[PDB]
Design a protein around this nucleic acid. Sequence first.
RNA 1: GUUUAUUAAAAACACAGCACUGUGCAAACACGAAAGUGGACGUAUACGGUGUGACGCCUGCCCGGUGCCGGAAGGUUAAU
RNA 2: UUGAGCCUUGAUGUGUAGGAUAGGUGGGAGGCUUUGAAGUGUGGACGCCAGUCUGCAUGGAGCCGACCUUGAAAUACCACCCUUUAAUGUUUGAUGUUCUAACGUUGACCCGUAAUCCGGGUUGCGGACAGUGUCUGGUGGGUAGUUUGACUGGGGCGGUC
Lengths: 190, 51, 77, 149, 117
Amino acid sequence: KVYTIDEAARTAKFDETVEVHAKLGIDPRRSDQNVRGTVSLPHGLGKQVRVLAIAKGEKIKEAEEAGADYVGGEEIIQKILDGWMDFVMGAVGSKLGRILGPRGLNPKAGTVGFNIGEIIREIKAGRIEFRNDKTGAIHAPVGKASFPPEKLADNIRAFIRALEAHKPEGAKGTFLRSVYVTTTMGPSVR
Amino acid sequence: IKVRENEPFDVALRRFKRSCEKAGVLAEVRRREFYEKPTTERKRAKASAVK
Amino acid sequence: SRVCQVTGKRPVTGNNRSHALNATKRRFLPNLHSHRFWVESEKRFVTLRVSAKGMRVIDKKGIDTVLAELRARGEKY
Amino acid sequence: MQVILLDKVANLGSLGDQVNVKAGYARNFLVPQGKAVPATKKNIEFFEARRAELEAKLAEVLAAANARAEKINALETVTIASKAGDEGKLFGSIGTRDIADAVTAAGVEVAKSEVRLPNGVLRTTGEHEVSFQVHSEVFAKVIVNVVAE
Amino acid sequence: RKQVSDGVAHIHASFNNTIVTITDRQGNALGWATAGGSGFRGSRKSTPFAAQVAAERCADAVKEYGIKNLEVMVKGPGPGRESTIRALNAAGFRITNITDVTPIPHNGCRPPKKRRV
RNA sequence: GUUUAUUAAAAACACAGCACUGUGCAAACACGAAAGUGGACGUAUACGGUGUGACGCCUGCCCGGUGCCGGAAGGUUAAU
RNA sequence: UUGAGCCUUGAUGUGUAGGAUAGGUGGGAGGCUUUGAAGUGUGGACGCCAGUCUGCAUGGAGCCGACCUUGAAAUACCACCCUUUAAUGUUUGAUGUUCUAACGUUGACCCGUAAUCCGGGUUGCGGACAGUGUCUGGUGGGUAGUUUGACUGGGGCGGUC
Ligand SMILES: [Mg+2]
Ligand SMILES: [Mg+2]
Ligand SMILES: [Mg+2]
Ligand SMILES: [Mg+2]
Ligand SMILES: [Mg+2]
Ligand SMILES: [Mg+2]
Ligand SMILES: [Mg+2]
Ligand SMILES: [Mg+2]
């Protein structure tokens, strides 16, 4: 249809298991596959996370209520370092790198923040909404989309999630939106 | 050369092949012409086959 | 002589401009072709030496009007 | 070119359409063997006069080769003076130029071969019936009554 | 694709190698295999064994028209000349009639010379 | 035999012979913007081009280069 | 209807510590199949004959996940699909098959005609080929026009500018 028949999911149990798997160009020259910072997606969706940031011994009584469920501690920088089955996410900035707490040797979790005045700021919403989607193998954009609770109301992503069309490589044709899972399969157009 | 061999027996039963062709006229023709030397060759097939 | 009886097209002279702009006098012949035409109004084939443009003229005006021009200037066909 | 056709013409034509054909085909085959013609506009309206006439007009004239039978059921009975032998069985008998000539000869004017008395056509007295023909699809029934006078 | 059931297994047994070809009655090539095709080269392929394992491979290639009973035509000397018809019987085959077809000129062409070895 | 008519008659050119190579005939080829014509009123035991030069005894090795001949998959590649 | 654009309906992978032939990351803590399965048995079949698959079938009622390792965990399910193939298309040419009617006929015949031209006609043979026009790449000493320096103890060589 002109946009999408957002009525394209009439059996699993809760068909929210949908994804933003669009198409981009090719690498004939020099371009890359990246995502900004926690792409929220203009839609409340309904996602409560357990966002893991690396603050300190003060950010445990207000740097944990803002679309999350905890924050790594000061004793647990390497005192959570004794297992592979034991242990979004984060890494504060400014002049602070975090290879001493995420480095060598297979998981992605970059976006948390960087504040020199607050742990939960007066106006800072947008983190715990939607995931990332960097480079993969034959393209990019993998993640999540709408749900079994909307209609054409999760097609708020349709005009500001497919509209994330940043400069295409060179010798390509980036443009094709698709989603779905747990019933059939498909997508309309761009 | 040919064997019908109908129903009961999966044994080849072609011992006929050792009754003519094979290394018979086929080892014969396989190589060096000969021409007159078979004469000599067969003059032993009888210088022997006398006894 | 290479002339189209419909249009009068005939060979014209000009140049062959090389890559270095050297001009050598040449010609342009027309795309002539003798062609048999069924005149219904004459129960007869009239064959004209015509250029391709010639034909297209005949396909539009119609062999009757066209012969009618040849006739009207003693271009006998 | 465009060219408008004459006869039916195979995988393209119709009988009087405005198809579009490669000029090689138009000259050299079609128009010469007059199966079509240049769509010289002058012509395409030569054909518009030919799009009103014979069709719109002479099919409500076969609505008269049809409403002849609106006067086939509004009388629905002619009698023939044909008697009876030894028990009300026709001493006469009536066919097509009897049921078309004893149809014409009143206010019911039919063409003599427009009266289908399937045979009975005919061999007894009293009421019978017949199939009256004016059009290919629209005929009409009556009732015939051979009167023994 | 297609089907037969009544067939013919042609074999070309010759000192350097032996070749199995399996075709219908009207010999239109249904499947083949060679002693080289399988492996073994040099001595190697010129062996009854190597001919067994070609006779075999050939089945997994002509079973692809579900053949049931088939005659056997045996050409040339060299191993694989009979060891092939063994691996054929077993392969899963009613084996109809056997014939030997090795050609025999009534003395025509002068054959090669030499083999001062 | 021919040749530099007028400073060269020769070992130069031609020559029978030989070899390559083109040409199926509306031949190749040649003279012709073209029509037309030679080739030929011939037809591969023919016709053209090229070289070699009676005859005798013979004519080896090299296809990298340059010419030519064949090739079709890739690569490159015109107007459009 | 053959070789290319490309798009729905599907495949698929022997680097070590291991229940064992991990494509890269992503939705993911329960879908489903009685719309009638796991693999026994042969059917098309890709082939490194190491193994995979299903329209169908003999079948006939559960298997599993963070489990303990590994730079990367589920053949639990789904797809945007890359390592590279395979089954209709759309038309479009394309290689293709005929046809005849443009066009060729330097076959035969008829008439103008007491004519080896030419024209018209009839026939036979070809046939949208061949050929020609315009455009276009290649080739092209066959033709053509030119260029091919100066200094210099003559010039040339050498050297120099
Ligand atoms: Mg002399
Ligand atoms: Mg002199
Ligand atoms: Mg002198
Ligand atoms: Mg010659
Ligand atoms: Mg000489
Ligand atoms: Mg030599
Ligand atoms: Mg010159
Ligand atoms: Mg000088």
